[PDB]
Amino acid sequence: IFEEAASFRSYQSKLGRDGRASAATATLTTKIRIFVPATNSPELRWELTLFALDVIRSPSAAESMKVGAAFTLISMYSERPGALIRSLLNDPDIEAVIIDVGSMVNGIPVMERRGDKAQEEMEGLMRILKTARDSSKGKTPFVDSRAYGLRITDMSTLVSAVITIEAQIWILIAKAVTAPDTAEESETRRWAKYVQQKRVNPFFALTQQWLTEMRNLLSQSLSVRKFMVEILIEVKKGGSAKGRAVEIISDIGNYVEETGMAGFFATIRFGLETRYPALALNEFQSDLNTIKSLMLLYREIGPRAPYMVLLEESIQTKFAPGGYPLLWSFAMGVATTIDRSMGALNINRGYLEPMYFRLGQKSARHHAGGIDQNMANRLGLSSDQVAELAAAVQ
Amino acid sequence: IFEEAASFRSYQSKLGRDGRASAATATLTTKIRIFVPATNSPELRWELTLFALDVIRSPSAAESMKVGAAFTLISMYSERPGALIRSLLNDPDIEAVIIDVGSMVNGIPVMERRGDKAQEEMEGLMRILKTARDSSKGKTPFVDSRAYGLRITDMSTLVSAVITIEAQIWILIAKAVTAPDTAEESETRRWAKYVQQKRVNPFFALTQQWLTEMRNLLSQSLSVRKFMVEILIEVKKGGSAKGRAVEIISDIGNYVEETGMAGFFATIRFGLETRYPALALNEFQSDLNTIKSLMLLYREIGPRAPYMVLLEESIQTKFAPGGYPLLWSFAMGVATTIDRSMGALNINRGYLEPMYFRLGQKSARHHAGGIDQNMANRLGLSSDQVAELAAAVQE
Amino acid sequence: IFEEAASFRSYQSKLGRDGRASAATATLTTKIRIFVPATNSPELRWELTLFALDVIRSPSAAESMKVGAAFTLISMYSERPGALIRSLLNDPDIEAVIIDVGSMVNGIPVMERRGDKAQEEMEGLMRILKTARDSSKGKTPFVDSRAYGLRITDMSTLVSAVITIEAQIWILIAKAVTAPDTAEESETRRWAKYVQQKRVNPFFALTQQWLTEMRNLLSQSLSVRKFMVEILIEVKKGGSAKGRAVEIISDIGNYVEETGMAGFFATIRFGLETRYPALALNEFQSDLNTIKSLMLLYREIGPRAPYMVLLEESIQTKFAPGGYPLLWSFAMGVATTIDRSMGALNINRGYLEPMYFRLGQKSARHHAGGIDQNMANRLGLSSDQVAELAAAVQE
RNA sequence: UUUUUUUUUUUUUUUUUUUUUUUUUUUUUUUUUUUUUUUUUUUUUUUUUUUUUUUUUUUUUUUUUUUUUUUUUUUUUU
């Protein structure tokens, strides 16, 4: 009867998603140069970090080389970052040319391995680096200029630096796609955390200007977000040995997961699992069947599922609350009454049903925390006790 | 209808945890020197402990020296201190170099077997130890300076001494990463117990100056907390008799467990297992579902679970009460009302949701301990007795 | 919901607590000499006991000597005292070397089987036993000096003597680690019995000065308490005929069991098995779950459980009433109101929770002398008569 | 056998939150003690065959009455 319809909803949501796309769909690659350190000499690693910071500080650089810089800038972690790149790159938009900087002989720019083939590229980079200084009005990437000056001999001091700047990139990714500005509040809150717990050395704190230039690069290159989410899934995998370096990335991950999918998970939290009497309304049944199909769909996607928005994967559309707007309007009605932080999520969408939102508000507030409507009999609480709870709840 | 939601919560929590993370993630190892007692000689072991105390007392020693000094200083228990470190190291931050010191030939500075590579390491150690003495204005690590000169010749007094300095490190770890100041109250209260029980010899008590220099090394190095929690799990394990040495560590452990997860367990104690009538309120169902997922998650993590804050594991975030703030605010509302130990824990966090906290307080205070709502009927207590309890509780 | 939380409490309690600790944890042994009788000669055995009493009486003897002397002393019961020590010693703190002394010809010091190997040991012993005598203002260990004077040549008087002295050690162990001073009342009781019941010859009573020197040795050595509790568990096992000696010990052991865990058992004995109306309150639920977990934990620990304070096993901490203070404060409020022997136990802990203690009084006294309910309808007599009895009893 | 109708048209990105912070050894009591053989009754005994009455007898066909018989189209108003 209805079972056919429910199975048909399921059918639509999985239809044609099976199998493999034709190689005729293969997109034009773009060629990007990544200067990998490829050495354990701490001097070259820190100089390359400064070079890379400056590439992103520069308004005269192209996006193609800025992405390449972000690929050198994160990934200072491993003994062989060329393995990290080649194994986790996984992007058809990109062909990355990896250059070992080797001895890093050149003073402020990277040394070219084919020094002779073009001097103009070394000039281009030097112009970019000068532009980085001059356009930033002499202000270093760091809030203390001495951090720009000092060059590092000792591996403890190197990693203290590197992990602190990496962490400063990774705090960005959490909101770079989903609220590309206005997220300095959240990012400084997370910064406060990592320095309080002494994981990062705040001598290497980066200026809001540099962080914004990098956050913008992240908002507008998918290629670098793809690499970030690749490595973030990689280190999320359990039971491994962890160094402090990957641990802080993983930690950051917990802010990066479910990003840009607020609507979806908020209908599960403050719609489904809150389980007010309103879930018996006939109107919602289509929406409930939708969310069932979405949860199974989420499961079908597997490990990439919590990051779909950063990856800009198409399937997100299905996830959007336009697919279940009665239940979503209701759920936000609950969310905004229950959770003070849900008050501050923007719910200006065209498909807001204000009567169902007000029913959401009424289910939490007007029903007195739903206190009359105890969900389960395990407490075996007195009727009197429930009434007292409702009185205390105002 | 609802089952799919809870099973999806499960899914989210277990997603991508599976499998083993690629070697391409492997971090730059730093070099740590650990000086090790080669032999059961009391003269060696006590001088080396004094040296090691002085390395952490030093303003001029490098963190790479200091953490390896702290490793030797808390390996002094073992019949084979080199084996203890190398077997429980388990740290990709670190490459350890051991210097099994054969005969302590240099005297005040530690020896090195083939010499320092250009003599400079011995000179480095000497500078370290001088600067320790000079910066400390002559004052020893110990509260009685006679301990510093003592140059022990018998194993009985050595183990008395060692165990007492070790205990003094281990009293720190309980707060070193969770409130590294305000710690002195706890650390002295624990000190009181071990001396009252005559387990440690108070002749060897260490100065607040030295203890804070070591507490800071613990706060700022994960590599030493990794070693500590490795050995703390190791000795917590059953099915052997114990030497007083590992027993005292195990004893300390009971203060180190649950550290830095106050909020989590407090929601279990004073939200969940107290089973107030307030758990019928619809909103808390989301949070209850979360804590169920967290309990099963805790189980899934296994032996490291009680120490996840000291070992700085990402999963901790999951556990933070920001993840279930309605239940947490209510549970702290109960906790602070019921337990006169509570409320000395800081609950100034953004997600306090104080209507639910006040409902917590109004359960335990206003509902007279929730007096009416008896959970189980095996006593079948009279209404008059419940009223007497309401009177005596002072609401 | 709640079932998972209760299982989680259990999980926390048992998490780790399996497998084997790695031998990399293995503690430094301390090497100790135990002199033992080789043979069934009373002339040896009594003089060796006098020597051992004097070693413990000495101001100049080392702790390593003293513990070894306490081993010499308590092993006299058996036909193979070497076998008794070696087989029931179970301790990594220590490394026991046994000397089967042979004929005690070399004066007041014990015999050396291969002569003096340092050519100093006998002189060490001479100094020890001289300083024992001299430090004492000319006293003997015994209240009558003739006991010190009289050599023994028959087994019957030997065993009369030995048992009397061994008993005097064993009466101590019941409060050597808990309340190690103010023990004396419960060492003069405990000497009432035995003398009255004619199990000991009070000719061999020991002076308070010797008993406190031995009590101190017991408080401040774990290794001796470990040996005592090993043999105390050994003799507690049934299914065998016994000698007089072991019976006196076993009888003692009924004093030694549950020592130092007053608070734990008192929460079960008072409060919990009293099943007051107050136990139905929401407040206790955490604590009740705790006690349940502890009872099954007690079961899991098995034979050593009643002695975990004297063995100072880490787990003890778990048991401490800080782990369930609301239930405990109430339980002590019951216990002190009901039992005339309670209250003379010191309950000045920090986690006193006095509103619950006052409710513990107000149940067992204020609620009609603990007659505001009757727990179950075991016979179904009339309420009024029982209430009249409670009024006449006046709480 | 036959005789309708049967294209389409909306909506469908995102935006919050998320490290910590207290407690947490121990303390009391804990042998015993009284009673604890027996003692009386304890066969029997009365009464218990039978006896009266106990066929039958009245009445008991029938008889009156019992076809039918009148009435029975209409008419005002709107």
Residue numbers in the entry:
A (entry chain C): 4 to 397
B (entry chain D), C (entry chain E): 4 to 398
Paper text:
The NiV RNA genome is encapsidated by the nucleoprotein (N), forming a long helical nucleocapsid assembly. This assembly not only safeguards the viral genome from degradation, but also serves as a template for productive transcription of mRNA and replication of the nascent viral RNA genome by the viral RNA dependent RNA polymerase (RdRp). Each N protein monomer is comprised of two main globular N-terminal and C-terminal Ncore (Nucleocapsid core) domains, with each domain flanked by the N-terminal arm (NT-arm, residues 1–31) and the C-terminal arm (CT-arm, residues 373–398) subdomains.
The final model shows that 13 nucleocapsid monomers bind to the single-stranded RNA forming a left-handed spiral turn with outer and inner diameters of 204 and 56 Å, respectively. The contact area includes a hydrophobic core comprising an aromatic residue (F11) from one protomer and a triad of aromatic residues (F267, F268, Y301) in the adjacent protomer. The NT and CT arms, which have been reported to play a role in the spiral assembly of nucleocapsid, occupy a hydrophobic groove in the C-terminal Ncore domain of the adjacent protomer. At the interface between the two protomers, aromatic residues Y258 and Y354, one from each adjacent protomer, are positioned in close proximity to the RNA chain, facilitating the twist in its conformation.
